[PDB]
Design a protein around this nucleic acid. Structure first.
Ligand code: SR
Ligand code: SR
Length: 95
RNA sequence: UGGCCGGCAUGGUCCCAGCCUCCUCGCUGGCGCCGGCUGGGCAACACCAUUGCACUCCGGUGGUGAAUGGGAC
């Protein structure tokens, strides 16, 4: 079952050999044009590696980012993008 | 040598260059042969496993089973 629109996009299929700090930097480099980004969360743990959460301030940004960068070759791999199942805390602490 | 021991070999002190390494990366570390014991840590690196929905840092295993020469006294 797909997912409903969200402030946060969930990206996976990312190159696992990239360190956390660099991955966050590179992700911002390509995703900041879609709108203000509140934060990017990345973890290299067994369960969370290869994935990232880009948290946009406005849902239109996420939606854009989602449609525009679906399948984008990043670090030699096609980026897969979806909306996050639930709202990230940063967003809850507001709306 | 990450810590520890044994056997054998080996004149010494330096100077220059090169080379080596998971555990004080370098000029007041190290760079003969052989065998056995043991500690730490995944931080870097590699390999294996993982396609995974978080907002709690947190998979496993491996490496030293390493590295040459010149010169001055
Ligand atoms: Sr050493
Ligand atoms: Sr590890």
């Amino acid at each position: 079952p797909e997912t409903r629109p969200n402030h946060t996009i969930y990206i996976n299929n990312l190159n696992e050999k990239i360190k956390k700090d660099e991955l966050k930097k590179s992700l911002h480099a390509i995703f900041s044009r879609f709108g203000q980004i509140l934060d990017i969360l990345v973890s290299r743990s067994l369960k969370m590696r290869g994935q990232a959460f880009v948290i946009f301030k406005e849902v239109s940004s996420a939606t854009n980012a989602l449609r525009s960068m679906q399948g984008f070759p990043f670090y030699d791999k096609p980026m897969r993008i979806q909306y996050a199942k639930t709202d990230s805390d940063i967003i809850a602490k507001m709306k």
